[PDB]
Design a protein around this ligand. Structure first.
Ligand SMILES: Nc1ncnc2c1ncn2[C@@H]1O[C@H](COP(=O)(O)OP(=O)(O)OP(=O)(O)O)[C@@H](O)[C@H]1O
Ligand SMILES: Nc1ncnc2c1ncn2[C@@H]1O[C@H](COP(=O)(O)OP(=O)(O)O)[C@@H](O)[C@H]1O
Ligand SMILES: Nc1ncnc2c1ncn2[C@@H]1O[C@H](COP(=O)(O)OP(=O)(O)O)[C@@H](O)[C@H]1O
Ligand SMILES: [Mg+2]
Lengths: 43, 131, 101, 73, 102, 371, 59, 146, 96
């Protein structure tokens, strides 16, 4: 349960590392968006 | 002969050397170091090493075989680095001045304001509509 | 507090005039003060301080010095500081003299 | 993501291995092949037919489904 | 010059010797045998060398060993570094009665 | 071992004489010790186990002299056992010495893990005694018949055919002397004493409650004659906490044979406890600790103020009187508070007025109700 | 400024208009107008793009 | 058969033009030197390099790890699903193609317009409405690395 | 006070109380058999067996999963037989 939060932190850091130039885009799909951490919800 | 001997001393700390972390010194000729292999060892210090560099967490280099401490290596968390500048802000000049006095000068020059003796600034409040 | 348990109690009422004198002196000991200061008027002007807010008044006088880039404090600086330290003027009609009068 | 047997010291690859998932996963495999007959089941004939048509028929033929174009359940 | 040369030579000869590990003793179990725990090698029983002063060797001594056969070498300084308590403990604080007023 | 007991307490020549006799004997021990083979067995065994020897954990024994052993690196090894290792001292989980080179099993290391109950083993019971507790005569007899006499003299019960009582509950107002009596009975019979106070067995993890109960009773069995004192049984006793109750109840009267361990539990609120916890088949002795009466209160005052220097004027009876509203703990608080009052006035020798003020203040430390 | 925009963009209209929109709303309007411009494949942002972005957002 | 494997490891600070700090994958931290001839400028913190497992000297800076988990996470069959197989999601397909396809297919639009393209999209809904299908279609139609 | 200090002195003079390991009654044990067996046999490591390759039922080539150490492709000694070993089986394995 710990490793999942520590990994979400790394996902957040790698996501925020997106410079404007990369031709890289991302899709996330879920059936229970309420359970999703509000950290991701931030613009 | 002394030139030969000193050349050998220099030859001791040549590559490859295993990096580790410095624990507190024991005596003038020895100290305890924890190699990056994970293990800890009680190791002779090479007498050429300048002692002042031996901070209790410094990164050091040890002989690969004997683990001999032979070199001292010369030494952010996230996107917490904001990467945005006052040039990017849309002209909030009054707020720019207020915040810059409130935090920026305390971050840069808190030692003078400690010389004032005031426990230099600790907290500011920002209020207004969102966005 | 039952007798076999913890044995004693000590009361800490808000600092009085003499206590305000001490605390102001102690927290001003490090600050660059100026002749012509009258700290006793300042202590008299702050009725019912809790002690911590006197550390606050020293802090605010120093902040007034600092935001003006002055490394010294004067009587006026402390006097406008105390105004910021009032903060109990936010009582007003609500419950000031009604209900919980 | 392959499984290769390499030299114990020089670490050169000198064998290609069948992938191994896990011991528990192999324990999940049926080797005894139990024996309870369909006749031993009573009253469940409709449920039996549903399960059979859903599972066995795709294994048996695949022609009756593909002739219709449906995805078998 | 000769003294310096001799110094360097003996230094190199000692530099050939390995790192002798670091361990902490859990229980002395009579002369010539003492138990010590070392990083993840684990807990080993070891015969003490000629210095033999075992009653000096308290538990948790941070004692040094031999790199081979682990033979006890010397007691080393103690491991204090009480950061486990120091996250919370205030040690001996600075607060003193003269800064207390009233 | 410890020094004997010196039981004059007033500073008198008798005390000095007893201390002098202790001094003399200890000096003779000094003299004796200061005033000063098996090499074949050594060269055989202590050289087969050539130093250094590692420490690992025995997992299983497969043959008469072959065992499976793990080490701190987590590896697993099938290795023979040399003949001198005591087989019956070897079991799964046992810490075992191993030859460094070929991992040979060369002796069991006496256990130094399971630290929780390891510190839980009190061994510091000798602070109290039946003498130190006064006035609990009927309760003393009850506890003696229940837990003590079966341990000291099981002979009567084996001759009679009785399976002796092996679980007791103590109840009453706090400060009446329940924990005191528990520690005193722990002292009178030198069977080892284990304490675990109520809510401290309650734990956040799903396991540690019942697991803690299990290892507590396991260590109690291992020490064999032992006392398990469950203080504040209330917190657990009044699904998970009920499961901890279930494990404790099963360990009290369940499968297997429990053996010699005695169990004494203490509560303030007996009427609130779950009837299952008070198993009338298991909890066969319920002992009330009521508030001390006049004779008792006199005894408690005497024992607690005995070690005190006293003036002439103290009217001890008038100190007692009242309407028996104070337990023994309140009396000890009275003693300490009177001592403080005497010290304030500089009296190293307490007086009656000290006790009067002490009792008045302590009684003022009661109640809050206006009407 | 970092965007392209056309010569006919009338910023003063949105400066004077009553809606009490925030700076975050400014950024949202500008990004959305650029997105409308990209939607029509037009490489430059027109006044109609700002119009549609302004009315598309806020209240 | 005469050949011997070299030890892989990530590199760190270049102490000098010759002494470098490599970090063997799940291993210790060393200070080592490049062999003789390899470039030194490209040896920057974050370049996978092979190490001779006798002197640990740097040789053969490798491009970067693929981590076969990721290889499986790319070379996976998404199906032949086209947009004409998803139905009733036309507005949502428009949004997804506008946020994920167009910024990739036509980055020069976002270059000239100067808009920072949205980084990613979140698909949410009840189970079995087409989110995974949407992703499958985007994978099967856009000729890229998925 | 002198009682206390000289009690520490007694503790120091008598030294640390001996800690044992368990060497049974002396008459029970040893014989040359113990040392001979120690120097002659092999302290085997323990492994899980896995994926009996059985590429020809002639060179079986079983995989092993020695825990916390490694996994190897290995063969039987001249003593054990193919019918003895199965997949899993928690086999024992020589150390070199
Ligand atoms: N709009 C649609 N057009 C065609 N088929 C559809 C549509 N929506 C759903 N389906 C069908 O319904 C099923 C939905 O499966 P899919 O895994 O794509 O759903 P999901 O809701 O994205 O999944 P999840 O529950 O894993 O989040 C598929 O078999 C797909 O063919
Ligand atoms: N005056 C401004 N100039 C430019 N951008 C702004 C301005 N005010 C807010 N923003 C936008 O708002 C975002 C930061 O959010 P912010 O407004 O600080 O949150 P809050 O609602 O807590 O004030 C930035 O991405 C920035 O683009
Ligand atoms: N009959 C008694 N004789 C002597 N001391 C007593 C007696 N009753 C209570 N005490 C005092 O009360 C304390 C013990 O209180 P106790 O009732 O054991 O606590 P708890 O209520 O937690 O079990 C001891 O310090 C003891 O001095
Ligand atoms: Mg899905």
């Amino acid at each position: 349960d710990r490793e999942i939060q520590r990994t979400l932190m790394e996902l957040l850091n790698q996501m925020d590392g997106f410079d404007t130039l990369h031709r890289v885009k991302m899709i996330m799909a879920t059936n229970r968006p309420d359970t999703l951490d509000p950290a991701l919800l931030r613009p | 002969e002394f030139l030969h001997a000193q050349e050998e001393v220099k030859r001791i700390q040549s590559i490859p050397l295993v990096i580790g972390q410095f624990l507190e010194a024991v005596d003038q000729n020895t100290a305890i170091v924890g190699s990056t292999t994970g293990s800890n060892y009680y190791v002779r210090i090479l007498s050429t090493i300048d002692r002042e560099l031996l901070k209790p967490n410094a990164s050091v280099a040890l002989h690969k075989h004997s683990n001999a401490l032979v070199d001292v290596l010369p030494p952010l968390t996230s996107d917490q680095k904001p990467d945005v500048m006052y040039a990017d802000i849309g002209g909030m000049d009054i707020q720019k001045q207020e915040v810059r006095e409130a935090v920026e000068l305390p971050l840069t020059h808190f030692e003078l304001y400690k010389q004032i003796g005031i426990d230099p600034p600790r907290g500011v409040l920002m209020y207004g509509p969102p966005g | 507090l039952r007798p076999g348990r913890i044995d004693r109690k000590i009361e800490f009422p808000p600092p009085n005039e003499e206590a305000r004198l001490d605390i102001l002196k102690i927290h001003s000991r490090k600050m660059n003060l100026t002749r012509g200061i009258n700290l006793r008027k300042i202590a008299e002007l702050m009725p019912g301080a809790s002690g911590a807010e006197v550390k606050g008044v020293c802090t605010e006088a120093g902040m007034y010095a600092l935001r003006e880039r002055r490394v010294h404090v004067t009587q006026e600086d402390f006097e406008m500081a105390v105004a910021k330290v009032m903060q109990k003027d936010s009582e007003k009609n609500m419950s000031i003299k009604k209900l919980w009068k | 993501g392959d499984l290769v047997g390499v030299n114990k010291d020089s670490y050169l690859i000198l064998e290609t291995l069948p992938t191994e998932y896990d011991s528990r996963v192999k324990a999940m495999e049926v080797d005894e092949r139990p024996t309870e007959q369909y006749s031993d089941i009573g009253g469940l004939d409709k449920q039996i037919q549903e399960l059979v048509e859903a599972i066995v028929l795709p294994m048996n033929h695949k022609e009756k489904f593909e002739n219709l174009g449906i995805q078998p359940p | 010059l000769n003294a310096k040369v001799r110094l360097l030579r003996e230094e190199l000869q000692l530099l050939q010797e390995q790192g002798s590990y670091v361990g902490e003793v859990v229980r002395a179990m009579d002369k010539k045998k003492v138990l010590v725990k070392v990083h993840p090698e684990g807990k080993f029983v070891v015969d003490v060398d000629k210095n033999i002063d075992i009653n000096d060797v308290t538990p948790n001594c941070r004692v040094a060993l031999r790199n081979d056969s682990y033979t006890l070498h010397k007691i080393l300084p103690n491991k204090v570094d009480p950061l486990v308590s120091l996250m919370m403990v205030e040690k001996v604080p600075d607060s003193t009665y003269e800064m207390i007023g009233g | 071992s410890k020094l004997p007991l010196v039981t004059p307490h007033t500073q008198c020549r008798l005390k000095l004489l007893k201390l002098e006799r202790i001094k003399d004997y200890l000096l003779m021990e000094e003299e004796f010790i200061r005033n000063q083979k098996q090499e074949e067995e050594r060269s055989k065994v202590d050289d087969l186990r050539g130093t250094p020897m590692s420490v690992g954990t025995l997992e299983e024994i497969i043959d008469d002299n072959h065992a499976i052993v793990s080490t701190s690196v987590g590896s697993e090894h099938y290795v023979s056992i040399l003949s001198f290792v005591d087989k019956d001292l070897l079991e799964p989980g046992c810490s075992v010495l191993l030859n460094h080179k070929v991992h040979a099993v060369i002796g069991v290391l006496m256990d130094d893990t399971d630290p929780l109950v390891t510190v839980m083993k009190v061994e510091k019971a000798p602070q109290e005694t039946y003498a130190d507790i006064g006035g609990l005569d009927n309760q003393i007899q009850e506890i003696k018949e229940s837990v003590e006499l079966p341990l000291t003299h099981p002979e009567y019960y084996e001759e009679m055919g009785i399976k002796p009582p092996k679980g007791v509950i103590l109840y009453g107002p706090p400060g009446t002397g329940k924990t005191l009596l528990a520690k005193a009975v722990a002292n009178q019979t030198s069977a080892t004493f284990l304490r675990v106070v109520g809510s401290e067995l309650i734990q956040k993890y799903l396991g540690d409650g019942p697991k803690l109960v299990r290892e507590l009773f396991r260590v109690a069995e291992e020490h064999a004659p032992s006392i398990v004192f469950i203080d504040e049984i209330d917190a657990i006793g009044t699904r998970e906490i009920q499961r901890t109750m279930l494990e404790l109840l099963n360990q009290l009267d369940g499968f297997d044979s429990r053996g010699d361990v005695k169990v004494i539990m203490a509560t303030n609120r007996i009427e609130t406890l779950d009837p299952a916890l008070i198993r009338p088949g298991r909890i066969d002795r319920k002992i009330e600790f009521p508030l001390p009466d006049e004779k008792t209160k006199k005894r408690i005052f005497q024992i607690h103020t005995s070690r005190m220097t006293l003036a002439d004027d103290v009217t001890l009876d008038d100190l007692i009187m009242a309407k028996d509203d104070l337990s023994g703990a309140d009396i000890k608080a009275i003693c300490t508070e009177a001592g403080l009052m005497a010290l304030r006035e500089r009296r190293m020798k307490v007086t009656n007025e000290d006790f009067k003020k002490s009792k008045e203040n302590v009684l003022y430390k009661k109640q809050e109700g206006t009407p | 400024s970092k965007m392209n925009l056309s010569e006919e963009v009338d910023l003063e209209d949105y400066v004077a208009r009553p809606d009490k929109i925030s700076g975050a709303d400014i950024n949202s309007i500008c990004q959305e107008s650029g997105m409308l411009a990209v939607r029509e494949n037009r490489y430059i942002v027109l006044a109609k793009d700002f119009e549609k972005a302004y009315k598309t957002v806020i209240k | 058969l005469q050949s011997v494997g070299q030890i892989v490891g990530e590199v760190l600070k270049q102490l000098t033009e010759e002494k470098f700090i490599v970090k063997a994958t799940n291993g210790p931290r060393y200070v080592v030197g490049c062999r003789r001839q390899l470039d030194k400028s490209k040896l920057k913190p974050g370049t996978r390099v092979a190490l001779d497992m006798t002197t640990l000297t740097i040789m053969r800076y490798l491009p970067r790890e693929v981590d076969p988990l990721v290889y499986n996470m790319s070379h996976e069959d998404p199906g032949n699903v086209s947009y004409s197989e998803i139905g009733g999601l036309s507005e949502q397909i428009r949004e997804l193609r506008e946020v994920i396809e167009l910024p990739l297919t036509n980055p020069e639009l976002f270059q000239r317009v100067g808009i920072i393209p949205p980084k990613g999209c979140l698909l949410y809904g009840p189970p079995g409405t087409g989110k995974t299908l949407l992703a499958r279609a985007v994978a099967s139609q856009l000729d890229c690395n998925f | 006070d002198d009682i206390q200090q000289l009690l520490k002195k007694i503790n120091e003079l008598t030294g640390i109380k001996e800690s044992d390991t368990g060497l049974a009654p002396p008459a029970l044990w040893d014989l040359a058999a113990d040392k001979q067996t120690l120097q002659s046999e092999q302290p085997l490591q323990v492994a899980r067996c896995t994926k009996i390759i059985n590429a020809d039922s002639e060179d079986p080539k079983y995989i092993i999963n020695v825990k916390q150490f490694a996994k190897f492709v290995v063969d039987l000694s001249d003593q054990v037989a193919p019918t003895d070993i199965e997949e899993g089986m928690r086999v024992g394995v020589d150390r070199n």
